[PDB]
Amino acid sequence: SPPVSRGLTGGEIVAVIFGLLLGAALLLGILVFRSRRA
Amino acid sequence: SPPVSRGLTGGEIVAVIFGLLLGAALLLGILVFRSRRA
Known part of the structure; x- marks a missing residue:
């Protein structure tokens, strides 16, 4: 995959x-509500 | 579909x-290794 300029943009990291x-x-x-309540 | 005319691709969800x-x-x-260790 490319570094961070080829096909990378600021409109992608937002999803991370x-x-x-x-x-x-x-x-x-x-995970808590499953069976770790109280 | 996008929120307001954007356009996504399969090479973006991978980040999520x-x-x-x-x-x-x-x-x-x-969070556990912080001070919740046993």
Whole structure:
């Protein structure tokens, strides 16, 4: 794959951080609600 | 489809899952190793 100029743009990294934060918070949430409640 | 005339590709979603899975595993890892070690 290319470095960060060939086919990379600022409109792509936004997806990383997005799913990163929302991924942990969401995942962790369900993981706890599963059977770790209280 | 995009939010407001944008245009995505299959070479963009790879970033989401990347930081998504790697984010939870990594984050959760440090979060535990922080002071939750057993």
